[PDB]
């Protein structure tokens, strides 16, 4: 099971990331997995 607003070292299908998970108001398609900003840090992830 996943957590919301509770920092963890989450592994979304091989993607290891740390931080707080907050709901996103920008919506791509779920198959479109993740993006990166100007700093190239991962910005979002979709869970199965």
């Amino acid at each position: 099971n996943l957590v919301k607003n509770k920092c963890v070292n989450f592994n979304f299908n091989g993607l290891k990331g740390t931080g707080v998970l907050t709901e996103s108001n920008k919506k791509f398609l779920p198959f479109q997995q993740f993006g990166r900003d100007i700093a190239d840090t991962t910005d979002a992830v979709r869970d199965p």
């Binding site: 740390t18 100007i38 700093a39 840090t41």
Partner: peptide
């Protein structure tokens, strides 16, 4: 402001934009 553009640390200015 309009024209300017993990493991990274930025410390806030001791004098923020407001105080500057």
């Amino acid at each position: 402001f309009n024209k300017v553009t993990k493991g990274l640390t930025v410390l806030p200015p001791l004098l923020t934009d407001e105080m500057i």
